[PDB]
Each structure stands twice: as structure tokens, then as C-alpha cells.
Subunit: 319 residues, 4 copies
């Protein structure tokens, strides 16, 4: 039987006999993802170029997500990569959910038409205070749901909840997300590692050794492949689909890494673990970090559990 | 003034006072690319999944059929077909086309960028057309380019008049001219190759890559990018500058990429954009192929970066 | 604040604190409409014509499969199916749906407007589900409406809360609420019927139309419009006011339009929009059907115009 | 073999060994039609309704701008513009175009069909371009046609080689040839006009229409259809046969429809398909216009039916 995102989420929401607020939010997010996809694919660009005789894509992506989440009545604190402060939903539109999102991740590299994406994490508001920015400072362990949209050769939405990970393919002819991969699980061990090796000069010594182990294996077995798109959603999704390891690790020049904990690292870690994978900073599980700043950075190394462990053994070797 | 791919090609063709045969070819290819783009973005996927109760084969069928029926071609070489296709007599025109209809399609399960690559030659003689007609060096290219099915769909067309970039507007099914007469940066800050094969590197590649990470003049190291789809990597090299390497090694002394419909059309685009493309030993466009599926090592991109690679290569003789 | 069909139905469903089964039904129906609209606009037609080397049956299969798989229905009546369809036990829900999946599709070769019409009943009896379940009078409707595949695709949904109009934005595949709680004009200036049957008209219809061309009060005559596709004619009537008539004639002594899936859903939308719908003898919504494909004469539209016709009807006993 | 409008026009242009200027025009027109179609189907409407926080004017702009930038035109006459538009010298070409960019847009609120009508003349003299270049009789048309934005979008193109119909595939933005060299039925079964204004009918129309409803023999009366949008009614007349009338009366002795960009292009299409088009006194294509916006009565369609109307018309003269 064919399944769409909206049918799937209404079905699970009825099994769980919830109020519907989470379902309303995901549906609002889904509309936003389709609007972003259409704009990323440059629909209507002919009008920018005078066919009949105007806002940047990440600004528009941010406006779309913000506006669709606010008007769902299901949220109260919204944190975006684009906004310094948490947005507090106005009283008449407030619901019980906190959302952290990157509206168009990888948009620095969009001039070359590389893959871009939207990342999101959804927390229940855990306190009875008046809603504030503090409500977004929960660890990834507390996520009710997370996922990402990938605007690649086709548009795919990956949704992770406590019942597992499911992949939906956008059918642009009818504007519906069709469930194509049910209950997804990552390979125990992959054959690809992914990181920016152009910065090897600054590598932590463990990262240098681990990558040396991938290119020059001690038992003279076959080397791993290298891939690095430079867009997290693209790189993380390839890890999920083919197995392997993705690294944006810490170094002495960037002791906490570069990616953001709330709206990049935590949702990707959540998808990974729900698929049977691992995600570490090296010192701790990504999801166990209690953030003190909504825009704080976190190092991340994720992928197949065996590949992340081998990096950890090398990491332990260098203390 | 707004410009479309079709309008642009008819204007240049009228300037040259040609017969229209190349214009008819390019328009058919333009149509094929739009069909491939629609399928690649998964239009109609709901019907595959039972809403009412392969992709590179379809891409090849799309390109094959639009070219055959364009009446401008006589020999078609595709990555998908071991032998050249000889167009049937009523449909023959004077052009040879070499193409990869969906380059990068092994890794489309992760939705990575894919693309179509093409190079167009003229028929080599008035005899009955044969596969030999596709064995010309890249220097003979009349036109070449690629479509990139990325976050958006873009067509890059390289002709003697230069390189122009068209963005597919999906709302109207038209290629809008967005980058006229495009030129690559003289020097970039990005290198692109699969470093997982570092065990097999030629010493010049080992040395050249070492200089990118540990610059002798204390400048900032290059960033690394490798999508693993040539069209994506080459297009990024064109747009941002840098260098793309798929070089020869001890296990593949002639490389991995195919010369006719991957290396040569990209080499032509690169040179037409002010960049360079070498095998290390010679310019790619100067290699005379003997087999339609022969491989070639390739190092392409910004001229200062390719020249710098060639100095290291000559250092190791 | 922007509103979509899915968002609207969920907001209304949670106000009512229902289980969601109706919302699941409507969402499945909306998806079928989007896919039907894509087929009507001929997306993918190029592949039928060999770019790589029936519409009402497809429309029926889309509505059938989406309703069956919604788990919300138990009896399905379609213009395309001789018998009611009984949903298999594991997929049964509490609703009966009667629909014309592609109304006007005989006259579609001229690209006339086409549409989907639907009416939704709660199953009223506790017997094992059967054809009898769809034989309820229109008064019992839970929801009804239509999709018009015209110059744009619009979905009209009438419920107890009134009539709402959603515009399909094809760029994102979403139904946008554009007309909230719509009410028809009290009196219009257009009449709509096939005047080619003037030879078979009953005296009251003959007289009513004569009054439209020759008003006794020297006011302006009404304009006439007749597309020949019920969704198009009724929707213009809803949007601009006026009157639509398909009375009985010698080829159709019980009228021509179908009671279950044409007259009742339109009568429901009209009355929820402040309009009227009569057979001449009784309200359409008060007709108790005995046969699922049975016909009814229909006169509907703005209330002043329908009353004016009814006054003429009583004049002739 | 699959055929597109662009491919078709290039093949026809090479048979005739023309310069390409007309082909550049039609291709520019085809692009404008696709953009118009996208807007009529309401793509991006979500943004108007605040998802992130003009239609006949846009149609006129799209056609004006695509014609100007084709380098194929010198005088442009539009229903939207009081005066003929003179293309600037540097963009001048040899053709005069008269068009209605969005005919029927008065009733577009009911989502009824709308359309673009166009007629293409060669400039006949070397004088400075002025309105006079647009005052040719329809006999001089080089090409004419219309786009119907209906249940699907179809482009009808009439030239000396006949009438051909192209279906827009929206998935790829391509007009697919679906009906080659079409001819209207010798006689139809449909009459089309606004019978609401029968009070003001010319007595000859009164008798003609009365004969369609009450045949003197035992044949079947005609059915009536009147969409109220000329492209829709005319296109149905083309596909199914019959007669479309927008005739003169004492209140409108020259009719209502405009001669240059409504009556003439349809007359040309009709005659190229084996149909007829008269004002009652003469063929529409024989009128020598004196004003770019002058009106002309039109009765067009199957030849047996127009001849029969002309018989009744002379009876009252
Ligand atoms: O949506 C609902 N209930 C509903 N009742 C009727 C309809 Br129709 S939907 N509850 S929910 O709390 O939003 C929820 C709970 C679990 C999951 Cl897994 C998801 Cl996705 C959503
Ligand atoms: O197309 C033409 N002639 C034409 N005449 C009228 C029209 Br309309 S097009 N010639 S051609 O050989 O195909 C050619 C030549 C140069 C370039 Cl640059 C390109 Cl693209 C194509
Ligand atoms: O849908 C629901 N409940 C829901 N709970 C959570 C969500 Br999310 S929806 N109930 S219903 O019976 O289907 C109904 C009732 C009234 C109307 Cl007006 C409509 Cl449309 C539908
Ligand atoms: O287009 C051309 N020539 C061309 N040369 C190369 C190409 Br490619 S097209 N000539 S034309 O005057 O525009 C013309 C003539 C007859 C028809 Cl029937 C049409 Cl459509 C158009």
C-alpha cells in the first residue's frame, strides 16, 4: 500500500492516541520543505532574468520555516541558524513544542549547484515557566523527533522518531512525499570516510592516524574511499545510505568543532542512533551534551558503529 | 534582455550562416536533458509505488531517440553501449555525438549529483558512416558540454564563441541564460580527487597534493572537495576555480575516466573557459583515441593550478 | 495567516475532537485530486508520444486506491463502476463515498474543463456493508465538494461549517485556502442550461427562460453560459451567482445528471453556501435514492433565482 | 517519430530555405505561452497568500517582451495597448504581430478557460514602421493561431501547410505534436452563441438559431454550448465541428469581437482547416481594416453550417 508522509504521521499519531499537535507541526514543516525545494530548483528564475521585462534562498528558507511553524499552533520556541536569539511564538499561536532548525544548510556552496538541505530537531517543552530561550537547551537525548530534507538530484525527507527512521521521496508532479525506505538501518561497517583533508595541517593527531589507517591499512587490505561534498546533509545522508564514517572533528584551533549542536549535530546524531549508528564528539555521545548556548558548536564523528569505534580506539590511543 | 538556450543557438547559427543542422541537434539534446531532469527529480515516482494500484537506461533511451530523430547525427557513442550506434539512413545528418547520458548514476541511491556529458564532432568523410567517425581527438570538437542535475539543473554549453551557462526553469521548461562567456579563475583554493587511492598515487600526485596541504610559501592550504560525480566536481571547478584530478596510477596507467564522452568534452569546456586539461603527458584534446571506450588520466581546472601540477610532474620526468 | 487544506481539516477536526478518520479520508482524497490534476494537465504526455522510443479510468483508480487505503471507508460508489465497491474487511472504516472521478471527460477532447465530484456519508446502519449504505438522502451528507481542473485547479469543500475554496499551487503541490466561508449572491444575472433541448422543455422551464431573455420589468436580460461540464457550470454559478438547470427531457425523463455523485454534492455545496437546489418537485437533498446510478432533474443557484423558477413551476401546478 | 513545436518549425523552415526570422518569432511566442500557462495555473500562489510571511498585464508583458527580444518583429498590436507598439530600431525584424495576450480573462475568476490569440503578418513596405503596417486584411496572414489554457494547455498553429495542434507537456516544458493537419467536420451538431441577448438578435440569427432547436425535417436539434471564452468555443468548434456566432445587431452593427487579434487569426485557422468565417456580408479575411482596434462580426465553423447561416442571412436582406 502506498504511503505518504501525511498519511504515515496521521497513522502513528492515532496509534499513539496523541493530541495531534506533533502531526500538525510535521505537516507544517513538510509544506515548508516543499516550498524550499521549489525555490532551490529555481522555479520562476526566468522572471529574475526579465522574461516579462528577489530574496536570498536562505532568507526565504528561514522565512518559510518560521512562518509555517508559527502558524501551526504547535510550537513556542524556535531556534534557527539565521537568528541570534530564540524566537518566542506569540501567545495566540503557542503550542507545546520546541524546534531547532537549519533552514538551508550548505548554502555557502550553492553557487556551484551542490546539494543543500534543511535540518530539524523537535523537543517537547520540559518546563512550566513562561516560554523562553532556556527551553531549547535540552540534550539531544530528549528529542521527540528529528530529520532533514536533502535537495539533491531528487528531494528526499528523512524523518527519525522513536519508532525508527523512514525516508520519503518528493514526487514533484503531485507535491507529495512518498514513503520509499521503511525503518532504515545503517551498515555495521562501511568503506567510505568523509572529511575535509585539505586542512590536514591542523588535524588532531588521532585524526591524522585514523585517516592514515584508512588510506594505508596495516594489514595491506583495500583502502577506504574518500568522499566530501562539503554539505553536511549530503555527506551525512551518503553515510546513512552506504555506510562509513563522517567526521567534523575537533582540533586545537577549533577545540569544539564547527557544526552547531542544536540544529546540526543533534538531529544528525538522532537519525544515526535511530538507524543503529553512532555519533560521538570523541569524549561523549553528541546527544548527551547539555548545551549552555543555543548556537554552541560541537565536534561530531558519526556513521557505521564499527567505523566510529575504530576512530575511538585511535582517539583513546592518543588519550 | 532575457535569453533562452534555443533562442541563443538560433542567433549564433544565423550569424554563422549555417544550415541549422547543429541548431537542430542542440535543440533535441536540450529536450532530452529536460526529460532526464524530470525523471531524475522523481516525477511520477508515486505511480511506481502504487498510488493508483533503470534511470540511466531511460536517460540513454532519451538521448538516443532525440538525437536519432533530430536528423543531424549519424554516429552516436554512449557510455551505455559497447558498440557505436549507426543512425539509420533516413535520419542521417553530418554530426557525431559522444555522450554519457547519466554520469555518476551508480551513486544515485544517495541522491548525489548526476549529469549528462556530450561532445559533438563532424562526420569524418563521405563514405558510409562508421564507428571510426568517433575516433577524433578533442581538438576537433564543434561543441561540448554537460547538464548538471544538482540542487538545480544547469546546462553548460561550450562552443567556439565561448562558454555559456543556462539554468533550467522548471515552471516553464526553459533554459535561461545566466552566465555569459564564462571564464575560470586563474588560480583556485580547492583541489578535488579521491584521496582514498593515496596508496596508488604517482609520486607527482603525492607531491602535488602534499603542496596543497602544506604550502611551501606558508599560504593557506587548499580546501578539499570530492563529490564523486565528475559533472559535480568539474562544474564546481569551473565556477569556483581550483583543480580536478583523476590521474594515472600504477594500477590504472591510463586512468579510469573515459576519454570520448567524459574527459574530452570537459577538456574542451575547460580550455574554452580559459582553463587547462592535461593527462600529465599531453593536453587531453590532443590525444587521438583508438577505442571508443578508452580511458585517459585527467588533471583539469585553473591554469596556474594545472601549470603548477605540470611542473611537479616534469620534476619527476 | 496562510492556510492549507490539510492544515484546515486538522484544525477543524481537533476543534470537533473527533477520531481523525474523516480527516484521513479527506487527506487521501486531496492526494488523489493532485494526481488527477497532474494527469489532466498531461504531464508525461511526451512519453506516450515516443520521446524515449485512459484518463477517467486512471482517475477512478486513483480515487479508489486512495480511499481504500485510507482505512476510512467501507462503501464506494463511482460513476465508472456498475456496482458499489465493498472495501475489504481489514481496510474498512465508517464512511461511504460517492464520486464521479472525472466529470465531463467525454467532452475533454476539446480540452473542456473537467472535475472530480464527491459526497461523504457516515454509514448509517449496522448491517454488513452493502450497496444499500449509499442510498441515503443528501441531507445526511457529512461533507461534499469538487475539484475543478480548469484554467487552474480549485478544490471546493463544503461541510457543516460552510464552504471553503482552495487553490492548488502546482509549484509545491499544496491546496491554498483562498475563499473562506463563501456565500453565493442572493440573485444573479446568468442562466445556464442546454437550450438545444428547448423542443422538450416542460412549460415552466420554457417560461422561466423566456423571462430571462425578455424580463417583464424591462430590466436587463440575463446572460447565458453553458460549458457542458457540471463542475464548471456549477462553480461559475457559485462564484458569480445565477442559475443552473438540467431539467428532464425526452432522452432523460428522470433528468440526466446522477443523483448520488453529481446532484447531491452540488446541492450540498449550494445550500451550505446560502443557495438552493430543487428537482422542481422537492429539494435535491430530500430525495431518498433507491438506485445508485439513478438520475434526477436539477435546478440550482442563487436563492432569488431558484425561487423565481419555483414560482413559475407552481403557476403550472 | 516524436515532434515538438520547435523541431517542427525548424523542419518547416529548412524545407522552405528561409532566413529563420519567423522561426525565431514562433519560438519566442512559444516561450511566452509557456510562461503565461504557468501563471494561469497559479504556480507560486502560496507566496501571494503569505506562505513566507495582474494576469492579463503579465501576459501582455510576457508576449511583448518575448516578441521585442526576438529581433523578428517591428510593429506589435495588443488588445491591452491603445496604440500599436513600435519596436526600437536595433531590435527590428520583418514581421507584424497582432495579439490578445489573455482573451477571456474577464471570466477567469470562475476558472473558466482563457487563451492567447495571435496573428503574424509580413511588413509590406520599407517605410518607417507605424500602425499602418498592421492594417492588412487577414488574407495576408503568414501564420496565426492560439494557445488554449484549458484542462491542458494546447497550442494551435495555422500556416500555409495547414493547421497543427501541440499539447504542452508540463513536466518538460515542451509542446508535443498530437494532431497533424487537422480539418473541421464538413457539418457539425453544435451551435454556440450567447442566447441571453436574443431580445437584441438580428432577425436572421433568430431564425437560424430557431432552426437549430426546431429542425423542419426529423433530424436532431443541435446541442448548445457557450463557454463565453472565444478560444474555448472556437477550439471546440474546430475539434467537434459546428458553428460559433458573435454576430451583428442594430446595437452593434460591427459586432463586438476585435478584427485584428480575435476574428482574423480564428478565421485563418478555420479556413486553413477547411472551415468558413464570415461577417454575414463578406469573409472575415477580406475585411480591409482602417483601425487597429476595429470590431468585426464573426460566424465561423463547419462550412455546411456557415453556408446555411449565410442562406438565412440573405433571406433577411
Ligand atoms: O497526531 C496525533 N493524533 C492524531 N489523532 C488523529 C489524527 Br488524523 S492524528 N498525535 S501526535 O501527538 O501528534 C503524534 C503522536 C505520535 C506520533 Cl509517532 C506522531 Cl507522528 C504524532
Ligand atoms: O543554425 C544554423 N543556422 C540557422 N539559420 C536559421 C536559424 Br533560426 S538557425 N546553422 S548551424 O550550422 O546549425 C550553427 C552555426 C553556428 C552556431 Cl554557433 C550554431 Cl549553435 C549553429
Ligand atoms: O480529525 C479529527 N480529529 C483530529 N485529531 C487530531 C488531528 Br491532527 S485531526 N476528527 S474527525 O472526526 O476526523 C473531524 C471532525 C470534524 C471535522 Cl470539521 C473534520 Cl474535517 C474532521
Ligand atoms: O526558419 C527558417 N529557416 C531555418 N534555417 C535553419 C533553421 Br534551424 S530554421 N526560415 S523561416 O523563414 O523562419 C520559415 C519558413 C517556413 C516556415 Cl513553414 C517556417 Cl515555420 C519558418
Amino acid at each position: 500500500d502506498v504511503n505518504t508522509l501525511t498519511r504515515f504521521v496521521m497513522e502513528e499519531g492515532r496509534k499513539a492516541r496523541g493530541t495531534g499537535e506533533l502531526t500538525q507541526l510535521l505537516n507544517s514543516l513538510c509544506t515548508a520543505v516543499k516550498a524550499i525545494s521549489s525555490a532551490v530548483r529555481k522555479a520562476g528564475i526566468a522572471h529574475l532574468y526579465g522574461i516579462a521585462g528577489v530574496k536570498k534562498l536562505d532568507v526565504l528558507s528561514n522565512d518559510l520555516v518560521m512562518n509555517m511553524l508559527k502558524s501551526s499552533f504547535a510550537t513556542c520556541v524556535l531556534v534557527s541558524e539565521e537568528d541570534k536569539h530564540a524566537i518566542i511564538v506569540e501567545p495566540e499561536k503557542r503550542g507545546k513544542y520546541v524546534v531547532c532548525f537549519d533552514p538551508l544548510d550548505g548554502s555557502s556552496n550553492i553557487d556551484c549547484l551542490v546539494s543543500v538541505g534543511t535540518i530539524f530537531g523537535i523537543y517537547r517543552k520540559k518546563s512550566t515557566d513562561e516560554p523562553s530561550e532556556k527551553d531549547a537547551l535540552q540534550p539531544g537525548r530528549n528529542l521527540v523527533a528529528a530529520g532533514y530534507a536533502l535537495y539533491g538530484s531528487a528531494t528526499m525527507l528523512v524523518l527519525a522518531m522513536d519508532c525508527g527512521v523512514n525516508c520519503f521521496m518528493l514526487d514533484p508532479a503531485i507535491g507529495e512525499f512518498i514513503l520509499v525506505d521503511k525503518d532504515v538501518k545503517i551498515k555495521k561497517k562501511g568503506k567510505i570516510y568523509s572529511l575535509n583533508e585539505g586542512y590536514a595541517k591542523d588535524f588532531d593527531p588521532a585524526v591524522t592516524e585514523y585517516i592514515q589507517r584508512k588510506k594505508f591499512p596495516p594489514d595491506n587490505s583495500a583502502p577506504y574511499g574518500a568522499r566530501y561534498v562539503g554539505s553536511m546533509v549530503a555527506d551525512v545522508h551518503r553515510t546513512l545510505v552506504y555506510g562509513g564514517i563522517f567526521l567534523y572533528p575537533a582540533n586545537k584551533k577549533s577545540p569544539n568543532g564547527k557544526l552547531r549542536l542544536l540544529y546540526e549535530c543533534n538531529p544528525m546524531a538522532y537519525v544515526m542512533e535511530k538507524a543503529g549508528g553512532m555519533a560521538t564528539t570523541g569524549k561523549e555521545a553528541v546527544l548527551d551534551v547539555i548545551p549552555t548556548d543555543i548556537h554552541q558548536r560541537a565536534p561530531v564523528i558519526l556513521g557505521s558503529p564499527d567505523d566510529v569505534l575504530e576512530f575511538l580506539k585511535v582517539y583513546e590511543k592518543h588519550s
